[PDB]
Ligand binder design. Structure first.
Ligand code: PRO
Ligand code: PRO
Ligand code: PRO
Ligand code: PRO
Ligand code: PRO
Ligand code: PRO
Ligand code: PRO
Ligand code: PRO
Ligand code: NA
Ligand code: NA
Ligand code: NA
Ligand code: NA
Lengths: 257, 258, 259, 259
């Protein structure tokens, strides 16, 4: 039952703590100021530390919940002495070692906001210093707020797009369907209820089936019907290309960070 | 209080609601396009068949129509109905149905979707002037057997057809597009599909139980100077929302024309 | 005998293409061109008898096949007096309309063949009016089976079939030519580029035909992750290949409807 | 005997597809997966011997075929010690690069097959380095001829061939699926729409193959003036079918180049 410290606590880091609370481990947090630390510690019902170093001094494992562009500034004056888990997009384990040390085991995760309901899809990977013992204990941590995917580091930026960023794309999609409902006479809340329930069921039906999404499309598209009319419209306007180009842009950005 | 329910025409959609119907106390019987088809689907479904549509009509408390909208006029006019009828067909009004079957029948429309297969359809229900408070409740019990039921007015049925009946296909094309982007970028199709399907399911579930709007979540996920806002502005640039909305418009136009 | 006499009024490219198949049947054939001069000319090319006029043809024949274009039906048919079942191959003209030109007392049939009739591999739709008996339709199916395969298609689906089977060979050729031209752009001689793609098209279609896998199933198989195929496929998506084809089929069908 | 022992390192979809053809040869086959577990698993599926490791495979075999993806060549090959001619099927990796991974003392060959190897109708390019004798190339051609046809293609043309023959089946499938989907839109069941178009695609390509006419010659033949085909063809032009295909081939080739 180790002691875990979280440096930087924004929305992603907060979403993860709910799940970490259901582990046997003891937790402590450290924010961007002492006042911010207290604020967040209050709403999570967890202790906080007097500084990042004070956190580092008492803790067996550190989780970094700060944004990637703050890594160099925030991390360089600190002296780490335990394994570190980064959740940051774009920053390689090699680059992290440059900031914190060549003598530490380092892990990356890529969770998403679904950690809020303990249903994150989280990628996990570690550097050469990560024993199978340590990787296992971290996997136990990630499994506490959803599922875990053994993902080689070269695939992290893609996974960031497919799983970390995609909930927002999924929400834009649902929102577009609901807005189309409003355009055509159905109240927003009601359209959103219908659409969300349909998304949920469709995804569950796919999960438990051996059929492909394209097999399902075939079943739903009655000849001369309404679905095939709308599907050909989605083809005309480039639905697939649009999603793919957005994914590419997500990945480009991850790379340049 | 147990009915005999007869199904005329059994396509993919009619087959999909059968599972739910089988969990009801009611007795069921079917009739396809020929006698040969009738026995093939009786075999497939472990349900008794009638010798004809009229034979079915003559012995049944309630009729569900599973035939395609384009076949209504041809198949229904020769027949003599003697009980409440449920149509699941896109784009055919109860008024228009009444001209096919009689002005003396209680008539209901439903709009289900393929998720009836897992008993998780989102189904619209409405009835004509001749449906009692009590009959619509009896039918709501039917539709609840294969998912959820929405009491929506008939003027809204074409929009509901797009939002719930057709949209699983649009959802699947979206899922497939995310997964193909994974393949393009070096992730095996099976794996890519597992990740995104799980993310879609969790995202929808979080939305449902949260008080936050879709746009509220987008704000939370879009870290300043991050990856999500980059991809989000690309979706804006290429017209994700306009594209979806135009597709729904086309779906509705088609329903109107049917 | 089982042999009947078959007369063909108007012989363009499509009518010529089915002749070869009709020659492999037990039947006697005779033709009639747009003029007596045209008739002799093409009777020579095909090695077949000609008639002195359409009505002369009609007076001796057991079955008429019309090879004239849809636009000429009214002009050419109305003056004639028909006495036997007629087969039309024209796009966009219903059996109901044909009967108004030709008579309400005749068995009438529609076919929709394609240029692959040339090598006896047409994909041909077949339908008949209420006057066509089972025996007659089977006799006509035997005719259509002589230059390809035959599909029992409802008349309401004829315009769509026209697009999918009658017009699509041209669309398939354009697509094949596009791939070969892309080979030329990138350093491969036209002839060699056409040999490679045509062979790949043939093999791919046979594979599809004998498999239980869908086209999309095959696409998943071929698209190695991070590979060359998925890159080309996403470019097809970006530029709207599927939308383009579907829009072209809609225009084909709109045309069939307005004819 | 004339029988040699052939070992396959890495067996994905493409390597599996050529196995069937290799079984119809007189040679002895052995495989090696990405792990000992994977090896046993797939040796069962194919009914073939497996090796305990890639090097174990190498030590007993007369010829190695590589079925691993281009991205893994460096990682997987460098630790191994090869002792025999090697055939690579990987897109975008030159014989020069392969020799830097594997040795300057080996005969090395490249092939570019496609998934039609499944029905023994691959369109397969073949080339060899300076170390490959006439006897060896002929022996390898015999191997490739077992699962399709074989083209003698210069290495400088391999990326283009990859697009025209290796990746294009997926593009052909998308095009076929587009036509069938257009049939669904317009009232024809998917299965039936796919049967009609696939048959038309097959027949059209055979017609082209055995004819002296160009694709464009055929297009002229099919496009009846004021007809349905020319309407659909001008819509193909408007929406840029040819440009789309060619652009997709360029992206395929760019990808091959960057691999
Ligand atoms: O909701 C419906 O009516 C359609 C019919 C086929 C698939 N679902
Ligand atoms: O495509 C159609 O026409 C039916 C009705 C909605 C879902 N499937
Ligand atoms: O996975 C992450 O790191 C991002 C941060 C905000 C939403 N989820
Ligand atoms: O937008 C970003 O940068 C973080 C990482 C994925 C989702 N939220
Ligand atoms: O030629 C090749 O190598 C590819 C691999 C998957 C499908 N065919
Ligand atoms: O997509 C790829 O990379 C492999 C090589 C050509 C066909 N399949
Ligand atoms: O089916 C037809 O009628 C057309 C005429 C020229 C080419 N094939
Ligand atoms: O283009 C046309 O009108 C004829 C009919 C289909 C093929 N050729
Ligand atoms: Na980066
Ligand atoms: Na309507
Ligand atoms: Na017409
Ligand atoms: Na390359």
């Amino acid at each position: 039952a180790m002691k875990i410290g979280i440096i930087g606590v924004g929305k992603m880091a907060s979403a993860i703590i709910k799940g970490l609370k259901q582990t046997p481990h003891e937790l402590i947090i450290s924010g961007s100021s002492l006042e911010r630390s207290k604020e967040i510690a209050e709403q999570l019902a967890l202790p906080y530390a007097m500084s990042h170093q004070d956190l580092i001094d008492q803790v067996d494992l550190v989780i970094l919940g700060i944004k990637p562009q703050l890594f160099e500034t925030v991390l360089k004056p600190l002296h780490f002495k335990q394994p570190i888990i980064s959740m940051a997009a774009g920053i390689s384990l090699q680059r992290l070692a440059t900031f914190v040390g060549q003598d530490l085991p380092l892990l990356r995760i890529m969770p998403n906001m679904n950690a809020q309901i303990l249903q994150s899809s989280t990628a996990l990977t570690g550097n050469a210093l990560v024993s199978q013992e340590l990787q296992a204990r971290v996997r136990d941590l990630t499994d506490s707020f959803g599922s875990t995917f053994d993902i080689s580091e070269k695939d992290f930026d893609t996974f960031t797009a497919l799983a970390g960023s995609s909930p927002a794309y999924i929400y834009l999609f649902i929102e577009a369907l609901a807005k189309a409902g409003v355009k055509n006479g159905i109240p927003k809340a009601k359209a959103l209820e219908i659409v969300t329930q349909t998304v949920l069921a469709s995804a569950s039906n796919l999960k438990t089936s051996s059929q492909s999404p394209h097999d399902f499309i075939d079943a739903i598209c009655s000849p001369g019907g309404t679905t095939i009319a709308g599907l050909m419209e989605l083809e005309r306007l480039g639905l697939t290309a649009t999603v793919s180009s957005a994914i590419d842009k997500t990945i480009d950005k991850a790379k340049s960070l």
